[PDB]
Amino acid sequence: ANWRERSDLTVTVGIGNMNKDQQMLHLMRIWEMAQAVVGGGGLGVLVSEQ
Amino acid sequence: NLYNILKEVTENAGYKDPDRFWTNPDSPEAQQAKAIREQKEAQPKPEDIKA
């Protein structure tokens, strides 16, 4: 209905080139943070198994 | 506050939806988890020994 508004997605024809390493390292650091939170006693309240 | 920090880090990383990697502490599941954790603090080992 609201296709004329373009209010949902933004287009990036900006080259989808080599970023995989970037969020890949980000996944490293996020997993490290998750381990820290789990070791801090935050399992089930801050981070779940899913 | 910790949840907000984690949300900010995740969003800066490039993931707009933060619930995929973190759990809101105000969600009912988190409240249930806190209730269970608090209930598991009934009494340590020497309590009835001393009483």
Side-chain angles (χ1 to χ4, degrees), chain A residues 7-36:
Chain A
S7 56
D8 291 308
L9 309 181
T10 183
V11 188
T12 60
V13 305
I15 51 177
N17 278 317
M18 295 299 102
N19 64 7
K20 277 73 69 177
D21 293 330
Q22 294 294 99
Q23 71 271 14
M24 153 57 87
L25 199 80
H26 293 332
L27 288 167
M28 287 323 155
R29 74 201 271 210
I30 281 156
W31 168 250
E32 286 183 21
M33 278 181 218
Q35 287 168 250

